[PDB]
Amino acid sequence: QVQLVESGGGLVQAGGSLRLSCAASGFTFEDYAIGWFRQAPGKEREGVSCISNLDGSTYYPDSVKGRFTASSDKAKNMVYLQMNSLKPEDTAVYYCAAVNAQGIYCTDYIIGPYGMDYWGKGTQVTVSSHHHHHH
């Protein structure tokens, strides 16, 4: 059985950082590309990062490029998404997904209309101008 488990979500002050992790199991990690996606209520799901465990290629849309960085640790079958300089509009459920990486390299198409093979259940990220009001 395949599982993708996201963790690292939370509620953070605007300008702050989070690090999401995607724990993968049940498939040959190095043969796949892992994408991070997000969906906020009222919007369509969108790709925020791609990393290929096969060729090391990465892709980020302009909305997050420079702020978010994906990395892969094959010893743990984990992919991370370091998110810096978070903005309120980055609030969303974040999902990780996997797709066979043979014959592809990371682009907007891979994390867009191409489709993924496996999906995680998602982790909530909330970015607040007044985080102190919630804890």
Author numbering: 1 to 135
Sentences from the paper on this structure:
Two nanobodies, called nb02 and nb25, were selected for further studies based on their high affinity for TssM and on their amino-acid differences in the variable regions, suggesting they bind distinct regions of TssMp. The two selected nanobodies, nb02 and nb25, sharing 77% sequence identity, were produced in the periplasm of E. coli, purified to homogeneity and concentrated to 10 mg/ml. Noteworthy, the nb25 CDR3 region is stabilized by a disulfide bridge between Cys-106 and CDR2 Cys-50 and extends out of the nanobody core, providing a large putative binding area for the antigen. Analysis of the SPR curves indicate that nb02, nb25 and nb42 bind to TssMp with KD values of 66.8±2 nM, 1.61± 0.1 nM and 1.76± 0.1 nM, respectively. By contrast, the TssMp-nb25 complex does not bind TssJ demonstrating that nb25 interferes with TssJ binding on TssMp. These data confirm that nb25 binds to TssMp and chases TssJ from the pre-assembled TssMp-TssJ complex. By contrast, the periplasmic production of nb25 and nb42 inhibited the function of the T6SS as (i) no Hcp1 was found in the culture supernatant of 17–2 cells producing these VHHs and (ii) these cells did not have any growth advantage when co-cultured with E. coli K-12 cells.
The type VI secretion system (T6SS) is a machinery widespread in Gram-negative bacteria and dedicated to the delivery of toxins in bacterial and eukaryotic host cells.
